[PDB]
Amino acid sequence: IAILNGGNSTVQQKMLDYLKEKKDVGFFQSLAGLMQSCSVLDLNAFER
């Protein structure tokens, strides 16, 4: 977030080029896993 703050096109392009050159499905799989494991509000714990 700190490096990409303001939507720096240079950094965005460098990340895209790195991902394209080094085909890394693991990065997207890790992102999917993180957003799947992100916590949400649960009523049972609040009642406890």
For the chain, the farthest-separated pair of C-alpha atoms sits apart, in whole angstroms, at: 50
Specify the length of the chain in residues.
48
Give backbone dihedrals phi and psi of 19, rounded to 5 degrees, phi first.
-65, -40
Cα→Cα distances 18→30, 40, 43, Å: 17, 33, 42
Chain centre distance of CA 34:
7
Give backbone dihedrals phi and psi of 3, rounded to 5 degrees, phi first.
-75, -35
CA distance 36 to 48: 25
CA distance 11 to 14: 5
Q: Residues with Cβ < 8 Å from 4, sequence gap 6 or more?
A: 11, 12
Q: What is the resolution of this structure in A?
A: 3.4
